[PDB]
């Protein structure tokens, strides 16, 4: 009966791309080629049509929207994106005028901040992907094209909400691009895919995929939402993230990376072989070190994710998200971790090294992805194996925790419990 299955992040994504199996998706499509899912389900079409409507703009504008930040208006002219944005606050009548008379496309940013269903969907996807998930809504009037051919820097899942739209997909000029750019049609070749999207249809393609769309002539406008993820989430980013941690966290024993480079090195007109061999030596040493120990390194990526993602979807107020309920855990209790996909474990760059636990239960939904003080729990590194126990177990007895004293077992669970991360079964 329910269009999408919100039981878990996995169930949500599985239902989102049905009938395509997740195994097939990641093995055959993800980061490889476009996936077009054309349906003819009346119920789905109606559900998609409820995610966001052109008519919602009136109510949204009464809440105070700004040009550039919350909404953009544009039209494709001579293969270039012409901006019709005004200054300051955006009024519904201004949007409608450019839309009806100038045939401009309306682009609304991060609708999940106000639309509850998109919040529920995007939050589940953030859990499933372990990456920030934003979205933009594109509304294009009949017989027009808002944007010229181009490619973006993110993986996208496009949901057709209202009307139909004519799409053309092209092979990438920059496969898995980490940057965006407009492209001249005279250099993209013939479309690899060309089709029509209608309410209830879903389209996925990887970053770098060149595309362009236009709403067919008629009286129906086109509305779709582009849910994006995996921005700057490549091996290259993670590699730099790890190296940075390995280089700027090490103690005062090995000053070799702390010593200064030769003077005037930056003034040389060649990559000196002296520095070349030296850098190669560091890289090899780092590689050996990475395989030498299952260390826990600092990660700016982890921190960026946990601090900017959406909080768990709450039907009512964030009660069970800030206020602990039920019964207080004891040394004889059986505990179960809650909101597991909303927690990260890391270390910062105290006698013994500490392990920090951060969660997004109190993150603000209203500022999600708008790029507008963040405390976490602390535990000695010796508690790591106990944390792994709580992480890798459906339910675990407080007394079974791999800790030397019972006071540690209780204290640990109490600390986690205070953040609503524990459920006493």
């Amino acid at each position: 009966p329910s269009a999408l299955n919100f039981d878990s992040p996995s169930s949500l994504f599985e239902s989102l791309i049905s009938p395509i199996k997740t195994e097939t998706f990641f093995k055959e499509f993800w980061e490889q080629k476009p996936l077009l899912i054309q349906r003819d389900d009346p119920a789905l079409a109606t559900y998609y049509g409820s995610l966001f409507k052109l008519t919602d703009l009136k109510s949204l504008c009464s809440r105070g929207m700004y040009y550039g930040r919350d909404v953009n208006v544009c039209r494709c002219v001579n293969g270039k994106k012409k901006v019709l944005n005004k200054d300051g606050k955006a009024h519904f009548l201004q949007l409608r005028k450019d839309f009806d008379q100038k045939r401009a496309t309306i682009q609304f940013h991060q609708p999940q901040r106000f639309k509850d269903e998109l919040w529920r969907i995007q939050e589940k996807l953030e859990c499933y992907f372990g990456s920030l998930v934003g979205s933009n809504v594109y509304i294009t009037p009949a017989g027009s094209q808002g944007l010229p051919p181009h490619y973006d820097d993110v993986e996208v899942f496009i949901l057709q909400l209202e009307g139909e739209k004519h799409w053309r997909l092209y092979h990438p000029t920059v496969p898995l691009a980490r940057e965006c750019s407009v492209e001249a049609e005279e250099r993209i070749g013939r479309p690899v895919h060309e089709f029509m999207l209608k309410p209830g249809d879903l389209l996925y393609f990887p970053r770098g995929t060149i595309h362009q769309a236009d709403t067919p002539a008629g009286l129906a406008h086109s509305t779709h939402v582009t849910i994006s993820t995996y921005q700057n989430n490549s091996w290259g980013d993670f590699l730099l993230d790890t190296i940075s941690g390995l280089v700027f966290d090490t103690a005062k024993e090995d000053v070799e990376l702390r010593t200064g480079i030769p003077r005037q090195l930056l003034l040389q007109v060649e990559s000196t072989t002296v520095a070349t061999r030296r850098l190669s030596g560091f890289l090899r040493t780092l590689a050996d070190r990475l395989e030498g120990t299952k260390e826990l390194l600092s990660s700016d990526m982890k921190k960026d994710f946990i601090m900017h993602r959406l909080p768990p979807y709450s039907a009512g107020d964030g009660a069970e998200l800030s206020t602990p309920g039920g019964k207080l855990p004891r040394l004889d209790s059986v505990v179960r971790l809650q909101f597991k996909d909303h927690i990260v474990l890391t270390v910062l760059p105290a006698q013994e090294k500490m392990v920090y636990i951060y969660h997004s239960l109190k993150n603000s939904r209203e500022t999600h992805m708008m790029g507008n003080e963040f405390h976490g729990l602390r535990f000695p590194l010796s508690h790591l194996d106990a944390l792994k126990q709580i992480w890798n177990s459906p339910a675990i007895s407080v007394k079974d925790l791999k800790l030397t004293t019972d006071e540690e077992k209780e204290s640990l669970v109490l600390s986690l419990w205070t953040e609503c991360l524990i459920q006493v079964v």
Partner: peptide
């Protein structure tokens, strides 16, 4: 300068 604005600056 991206057309799709994944994360507002």
């Amino acid at each position: 300068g991206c057309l799709h604005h994944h994360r507002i600056n």
